[PDB]
Amino acid sequence: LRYLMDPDTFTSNFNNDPLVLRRRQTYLCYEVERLDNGTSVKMDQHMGFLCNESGRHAELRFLDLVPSLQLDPAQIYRVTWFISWSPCFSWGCAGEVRAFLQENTHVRLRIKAARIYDYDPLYKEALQMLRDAGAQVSIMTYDEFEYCWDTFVYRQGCPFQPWDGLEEHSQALSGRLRAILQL
Numbered sequence: 001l002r003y004l005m006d007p008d009t010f011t012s013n014f015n016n017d018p019l020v021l022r023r024r025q026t027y028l029c030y031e032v033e034r035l036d037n038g039t040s041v042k043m044d045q046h047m048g049f050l051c052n053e054s055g056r057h058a059e060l061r062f063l064d065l066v067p068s069l070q071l072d073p074a075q076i077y078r079v080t081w082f083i084s085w086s087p088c089f090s091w092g093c094a095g096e097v098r099a100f101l102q103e104n105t106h107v108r109l110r111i112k113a114a115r116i117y118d119y120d121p122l123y124k125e126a127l128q129m130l131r132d133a134g135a136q137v138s139i140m141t142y143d144e145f146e147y148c149w150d151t152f153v154y155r156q157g158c159p160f161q162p163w164d165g166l167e168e169h170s171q172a173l174s175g176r177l178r179a180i181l182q183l
């Protein structure tokens with residue numbers, strides 16, 4: 001029912017090797033949980049993935065589709081993004097997400113990023129702006145990559161195969177992100 005990602009597209013876009021060139025696209029896998037007094041309700045209708053299209057970054061395209069999710073404003077939600085690049089500032093993503101979180105205080109956001117989008121001169125301000133708007137931002141580790149493979153990919157029951165250096169790159173990126181976000 002929910003359309004599943006090609007496995008080579010996954011591997012190519014979520015690779016966290018710092019030397020691989022893959023700026024041209026961003027893949028954003030999302031899920032929404034409704035929190036019903038300590039109880040999480042996570043429905044497949046609120047799960048999917050998006051990439052950039054017509055020059056519009058995937059994060060903005062996620063914001064475009066929030067009305068279609070039909071979230072009840074009387075309820076509390078946690079959205080999680082597994083995203084191949086952390087959000088930018090200069091093409092509007094961090095500021096639109098901040099505005100979204102400020103307008104929708106019934107929604108909380110967790111962003112798990114495979115790599116840091118440092119092509120933007122203001123990338124650190126982007127990450128800090130997301131943190132300060134209440135988003136929990138972190139770097140994807142083995143556990144997250146495996147979850148995404150298992151959840152969003154057309155894997156035909158086949159297990160996640162971690163690429164060489166996955167852990168080393170993830171811990172390195174995590175150090176860099178935690179230094180940016182230190183409070």
Ligand SMILES: Nc1ccn([C@H]2C[C@H](O)[C@@H](COP(=O)(O)O)O2)c(=O)n1
Nearest residue numbers: 018117118119120121122123124176
């Ligand atoms: N630990 C780091 C910090 C910055 N950089 C890169 C990201 C940018 O392309 C460039 C300038 O970053 P900054 O403005 O944060 O110093 O260096 C990196 O590759 N590794």
Ligand SMILES: [Cl-]
Nearest residue numbers: 138139174177
């Ligand atoms: Cl982290």
Ligand SMILES: [Zn+2]
Nearest residue numbers: 057088091093
């Ligand atoms: Zn962006």
